Design a binder for this molecule. Structure first.
Ligand SMILES: CN1c2ccc(NCc3ccc(C(C)(C)C)cc3)cc2-c2c(cnn2C)S1(=O)=O
Length: 255
């Protein structure tokens, strides 16, 4: 899915990914607003091969809650063309809308994300660059998984087996999603604020967990705590999370 460069009008810098700046632009095939990943060092084929890898691996992915890849330009400057999430990063969206988003919206986002994570697992996709993981906002009622920002290891988000042994499985992704859920219900507050990364594993191994967010339904906090089972085998699967989140969303909308 090689795009002709003259079909792309490169606009302003809107964020960053692991390899360089992300720009807004326009793609005429007309007037589709898109985001364009650029790559600082893609004159080197070693860098170029890594920059493009997931764009190729994820090319045929199509999920409402995952940023869609549109195309690539593999001549220097190498670019990846993808859908534009016009409302930016979910963390800042939640912060600026702290007193204006209903709890039902927060639960909707968690649910949407669970559907995306179940789908990726169904494609046997393993996402290894965990530091790059991010959630973007495409509309008031739609969030999407991405690997770049708009506007080091994430120890405070990681499963105990990942911190201790660098074991990474779907179960470790479930732990991290539990943390994501907590952040959403906290209007974008990061976990373990002010805590040294070094001291996180000690707290977990003392049985401590992130506390129930204000206004979070106890059923949803219960689900988060299951994601944070120390034993990865006792964590729920993404299928179960999706089912359970759907039930929780309905209940909140009925309040
Ligand atoms: C919510 N979590 C999460 C957020 C983002 C991602 N990114 C995977 C991805 C990589 C590349 C793209 C392209 C198409 C833009 C190139 C899209 C999505 C992953 C996750 C995640 C979590 C737990 N498991 N997984 C896979 S999370 O951190 O809770």
């Amino acid at each position: 899915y090689e795009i002709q460069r003259e079909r792309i009008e490169l606009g302003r810098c809107i964020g960053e990914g692991q390899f360089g700046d992300v720009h807004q632009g326009i793609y005429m095939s007309p007037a589709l607003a898109v985001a364009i990943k650029t790559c600082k060092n893609c004159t080197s084929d070693s860098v170029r091969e890594k920059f493009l890898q997931e764009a190729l691996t994820m090319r045929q992915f199509d999920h409402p809650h995952i940023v869609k890849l549109i195309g690539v330009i593999t001549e220097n400057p190498v670019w990846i063309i993808m859908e534009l999430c016009t409302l930016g990063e979910l963390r800042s969206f939640l912060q600026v809308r702290k007193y204006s988003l209903d709890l039902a919206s927060l639960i909707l986002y968690a649910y949407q994300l669970s559907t995306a994570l179940a789908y990726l697992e169904s494609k046997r996709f393993v996402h290894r660059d965990i530091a790059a993981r991010n959630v973007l906002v495409s509309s008031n009622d739609c969030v999407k998984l991405g690997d770049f920002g708009l506007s080091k290891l994430p120890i405070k988000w990681m499963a105990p087996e990942s911190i201790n042994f660098r074991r990474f499985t779907s179960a470790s992704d479930v732990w991290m999603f539990g943390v994501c859920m907590w952040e959403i219900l906290m209007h974008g507050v990061k976990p373990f604020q002010g805590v040294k990364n070094n001291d996180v594993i000690g707290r977990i191994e003392n049985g401590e967990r992130l506390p129930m967010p204000p206004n979070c339904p106890p059923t949803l906090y219960s689900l988060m705590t299951k994601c944070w089972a120390y034993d990865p085998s006792r964590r729920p699967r993404f299928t179960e999370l999706k089912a359970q989140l759907s039930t929780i969303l309905e209940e909140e909308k009925a309040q």
